[model samples]
Target chain A: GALWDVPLSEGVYRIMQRGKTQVGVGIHMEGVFHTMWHVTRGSVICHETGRLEPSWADVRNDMISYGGGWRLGDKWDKEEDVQVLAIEPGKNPKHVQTKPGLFKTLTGEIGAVTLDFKPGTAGSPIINKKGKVIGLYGNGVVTKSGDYVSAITQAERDYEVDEDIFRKKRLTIMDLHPGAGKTKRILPSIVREALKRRLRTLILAPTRVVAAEMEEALRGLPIRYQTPAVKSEHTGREIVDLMCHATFTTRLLSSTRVPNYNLIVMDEAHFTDPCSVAARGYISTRVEMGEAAAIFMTATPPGSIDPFPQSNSPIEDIEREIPERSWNTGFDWITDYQGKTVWFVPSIKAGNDIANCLRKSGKKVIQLSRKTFDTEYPKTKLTDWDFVVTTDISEMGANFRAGRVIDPRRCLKPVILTDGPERVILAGPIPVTPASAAQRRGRIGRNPAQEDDQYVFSGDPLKNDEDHAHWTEAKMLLDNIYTPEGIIPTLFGPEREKTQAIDGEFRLRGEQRKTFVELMRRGDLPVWLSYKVASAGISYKDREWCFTGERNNQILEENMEVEIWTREGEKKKLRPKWLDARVYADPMALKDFKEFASGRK
Target chain B: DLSLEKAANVQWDEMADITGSSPIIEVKQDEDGSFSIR
Candidate 1:
């Protein structure tokens, strides 16, 4: 990070009043008044609404906080210190913490008064003796002395103390790996709970499409032991009365919020997407909600950053994230689907396309898209070996289809996730982090399920080249091949070789395939290896092969010598060869076997 | 003036306690610096 003079927007809550020059200052808050906010900027201009975030110091209703103009600071106070740190002005602003008089407050028209303000620091913050902000330095106010006054008292907002938290005090913190065709069923329990309690629930989504899709799903929820509510988002009053508020986080209105709702579900709750400016909406909502209970439903949560997090990932480390164009990624969900299949794609076309494919693959997929998304299948009734397809919105809830006869000894509830413990294949429009991919693959298989395994196939929605991204995976192959212990008795071997055949089977001792196998065992660590080498289990009787790409068996026969005896048992040693072979030909390995061993395309 | 009974803290004889405990036991040190007490 470098030095900067202008306002550092990233380091503060940027409150801008139009043009760049009109507001050249920042407002810094101590932890007493701030939300955990981080900003990533980009070309698109988004003016989002802020909410009455609860101050960590005083979460009481009277001290509810919201700011109109943000011009910036992550004013974090950690007990002993006021940590209104750094100013981020320009693009690529150095993360250096700047100091006092950096703020120029335009307190706006009200009974805004300031005491003991000097003419020179007119647009600056006036600090009292103890280095704390008392008020703003004013160009207009004629005040007597130390008293700095603003009608900070002018706003008469309703404050029924602790009335918000009066609803519920539970915000608790808390997956099986998957199998065949499935529909996630956990959403029904909440639907049932909401219906029975006659509670209005709000299911907040990252986007409105997601919200509408959720509304569609809920409108179709059928009670297995009972009946259909015929509940839908028929009217605004229906949304408030019959069941749900399925909306994007952006339009989270609080003015008429009735506090009696049973559920406040945050879809993609831990969508720790740093570049997503939309992340700010949910972050602000969480901070403002205080202890107001809500189910944080997310697969990807944060790790050791601000509630507004930062990432070093090239895609995410930005001023603002350019969202991937939501291509009809339908092919991704069902291309390799097998067992109990349920596919979800963002686009209705994709859903229909995937459903068609699954049907072609001989599935009575709940074969539909968001169009008939209102056609609800009961979670209990959808439990068949066959699979289905839907929009990403319907990928909600906890469990799905897995056929097993339950024994009375089964004390645990068997829940299989929609994607199952396996995948025939998976493709999507967007790229994913390896960590995210790992979490997606967390479906479990119990032997029979594990026997017929599957794989996830990822696709790049945007791609072409890299500064050698594949190289690292390649170098992962090459790097570990060269580590200390990796040098077997064969490579630069100081020890004599030993071999044996175990009951007529090849023991892969001195063979070149053994070296390749050893190296491949360190999969994803060194060398890009494929399943073929292990799958065939074919042991090539490699006699003489050099790393420099030469089939040295003929050469070794003409030059060097070693000893060997057949199945009956015998041994021998050899003395032969010259400097040129070990030196000049060290890298040789015949192209055919080399390609086979390296799993190279 | 100080005999074994009078001077309680100083028991300079290293093998005395063991020697007094059992007459059947013996300890020997080899040149390699390993010892056996049997």
Candidate 2:
């Protein structure tokens, strides 16, 4: 049994983990597994490895057992895997002569033939009777006009496992708190309470699936529950009748002002922190309608820690009254699988193209991209890939299973795209420069495996120092926020005080700190800010005042400058000069700006 | 340069001349004793 303490008034505290191990499981488990194996085996491997030095076959076996570390699978099909007997030179081998007569090595035996070699088949391998590689199967010749020439080669290509190295360098730590049991079980209680309250409730989930699941859980409730149009198809009459327990939907549900609700319960309140777009919208709209009682529920509460010196007044108050309940399930340990095969493909284009091709061939592919805050890149519109993009933005309110992530970006940068549930892919982008190549490669193969395989494509070889530096800074910032130890200290004592002050400042400025915090919290700020506002410190006062005609021109100008600087300086890009001038020039600019800035437009 | 009494008489004559050209004098008055003559 744990001891409970009661506190008075709202105060902020940093919830730093007492030990380094107490980080979020979602964030750190992958890194920890990699480190543990890399240290013991002298190599980073995500696949199973029984011996210190295992062969390619051993690694492949591990992969199949461990669900094949990535979206690729190992299967042999006769049509897909064919042995070439020989390649005979054609009329114009230089230009079109690649048109060579081909014969099947597996079906045909050696015949009296003289054949010329082809450049395309230079590196083809020769296989022995034991299915082992014997020699390189180069282009050979066939003499008689009716005779067939074939090139026999062994299979040299093994699934490239690269995640081991990537996971070893940068560590990801996730601290699971109490009350964080299986989401399917935890979500029902919250929904039941909302049903009893019969308050106009807003169920904020990270993904449509989770939202649907929550709604399904409440299917047989006594209340007449109707989902809103944005989230579901419940009509106004249905809403008035209070016949809805949960509604599966998106962020648009918060825009409605009708159905004066008595209570506004945010299903995943932990996600309502400073960085989530959904959280920002929900909090802003909920705050505007001051009469409703707002309640939040999540497995992970805002940690008792603050990353920066700024204050977080709202969080502080909530922490004081509600000591977040943790459901210790006792099954919170990370498992290490040996003989696993991990493949790391570091580029989005490469990974996406490969996955697309593999998917066309009838293979299951799970593709996860970095989470972006831009409404332009809506997750609902992403139908091209089969897998979901795991992001910290959706951590609090969404439910997903542990699965393999196909990462194209070589560096395992935190995805900050949207509030959606997904499995994490701890891979980052590959660098172009030689100096940064090792660093980029280091992100793969952290988990111990039988063999470490890395595939470096010729198209986008590596990233430059500048690119590497950008990713490095991004990773550092994310590690500072999402890790349990990183956030815990800020929730209490001095750190708490600082966080409260920052939160206060954010509210006083009338700027939505929740969005910014969510960005920082999700580690998606660097990428999002880099894209949105890459210029630092250009005054937009004259332009803003010209439009808003509000007396707060100086304040708005300062804020814009800060936004620009934060975006541009970190991203190493310049902002548009007309942005500030345009804002200042229009009278209705404030309204337009608000719409645009708030992502409603 | 006309005297006040003469100016008053002239103004009244001018109004009468203008009114004589019209068919009838229409005057509307509100409860507050404010009136408009057309």
Candidate 3:
């Protein structure tokens, strides 16, 4: 009763069956590139356990035989329910003789049936109520003559068992500490906890030296992480599970198909600007996958302040929250000497004369230049020299415990000069942009514990037209981006009208106001936009400056009008009022209005 | 006209002398004050 066989002449039969199997069976055939036939048969039932099980079947057979006959069994009746789909015709086989080479002659041909029930029908076996093999419904077949005879392929009776399925969950920062940064010295503890959780991490820094320092600090830790590509000096393929810079990780993450990890930590997270190509790419890929948990770390987080504020209170709140953190907290040692302290000594002779004078005064001087010194000049003997002559490459990662910076090129000339003595003399021409000047100014008096002085020597002589132009341009850029009446308020508040009125007047008076307005409107505002004017503006509050270079009156008018219209969409009240005020105000008064509107008495 | 041609030859010779070689000796002059150098 369990296995009753029925005899049948060579013909096709339609059979139906079903059970716990879902994956179609793999039937091995001879003489192909690992010859295997895959056939789709039977309907699948979605079980409560989220697994699919087969419950229906259809079999079609078309076979011609010389001596073999079809075998039918009673295995189908065993299932509680069954649904039959379809059955179709198959191909017949004929004998063919082969030719022999040389003297040998071929004789008899082989007889084979080319069964073609259906192209996609591959089914599995069925069992009947009497526990007998009922029929083969879902599979595909190939005849002895190498033609496809469609048949049914069966699914497995149950889901594949995996004991560790639930235990293989992804690792995350929560696994280390649910509330980590609330405590001081969390990095070491968090790293230790991550190691315990068997989580992989990636750390990225702006500079290679910082990355190297982090790697050296965590050398004792069990967790693995790679430094940046230029620092690590290793191929990416060799870097297995570890933290590395976004540059090294970018190509690998983009090209290779890897199983997603649990935790991704990005250090200095404020670098999500369009300029940070690697960071942009990595973040986009991570966001697309939505598999890994991303953690961003930065002392200054991006987008913390709303560009457009609904209320003045919120704007004030944002201002209060985003106050600049001073790297040093002592008396500002950079004294404002009224007469020509900002000297632009452009020639090396002039620079050396000043250096020689400082050397004679028993002061320690550090010079940074792009040029290599003479062979007689010792590279490593910094302790002995009264002055250290190095390049700008040494500027990063190394803290100069100096008083002043004499960056005569204003940090733009690819040369830096610093010392650890009295007053940090930054002897150089101040940058043409406000943001750069602020960054340069930040280098001095960095440590609060030490008293330092900053002296910026403009390369152009005092009261020179070129020097004045540079200063003016720098101030304009800074004011536009950071000052309260500038880009920040224009972006976030309904205060564009007042700002633009002042801005438009300055524009008509041969000042390059359009460029600044364009920078603000495009939101290409630099990260250091706020800091530049915030710090440096205090020094050059009432400086006399000029707008030099060729002027384009037409471009200025068109650009300013375009800028007004663009900002009008978002800051409607500010832009319209500003435009009206500009129309009423005398063109000559624009500069005075801007200076007065800034409220820097 | 003969004096003008002589003056022109003197100028060309002075140029060749300064340059240490003849630059226009192989060139034929056209009426438009233009010539191709060899």
**Best-fitting candidate, measured by TM-score?**
2
Please, what are the lDDT tens digits per residue for candidate 1 over residues A1-601? 1000000012223323342312222233432222211111101112342222221111111111222222122221212211111222332111111112111123212222222322222223322223443332222221234233221111121111122322454442221122211112334345455555555555454443444445554565532110112212223442332222222211121112323344454555433221121222332333344423445444344331121122111111112121122233444433343455433343444545645655665667564332244444443243454654444333333233322110101001111112422111112233433323323222212112122323223332222112212222222222212112322111101100111101212122233434444433322111222212322343333222222222332233324542333223433232111112211121222222233323331
Cα RMSD, each candidate: 34.1, 37.2, 35.6
The order of the candidates by TM-score, greatest first, is 2, 3, 1
TM-score for all models, in order of appearance: 0.25, 0.28, 0.28
TM-score of chain B of 2: 0.28
Q: Tell me the TM-score of chain B in each candidate.
A: 0.25, 0.28, 0.28
Candidate 2: true contacts recovered, fraction: 0.00
* Candidate 1 residue spans exceeding 4 A from truth: A1-257, A260-295, A303-338, A344-346, A368-371, A374-380, A383-385, A402-428, A432-455, A460-601, B1-38
Which parts of model 3 are misplaced by more than 4 Å? A1-184, A223-246, A249-261, A269-275, A303-398, A403-601, B1-38
Evaluate model 2: give its TM-score.
0.28
The TM-scores of chain A alone, one per candidate, are 0.26, 0.29, 0.29
Q: Which ten residues in a row have the lowest lDDT in candidate 1 chain A?
A: A405-414
In terms of lDDT, the poorest run of 10 residues in model 3 chain B is B1-10
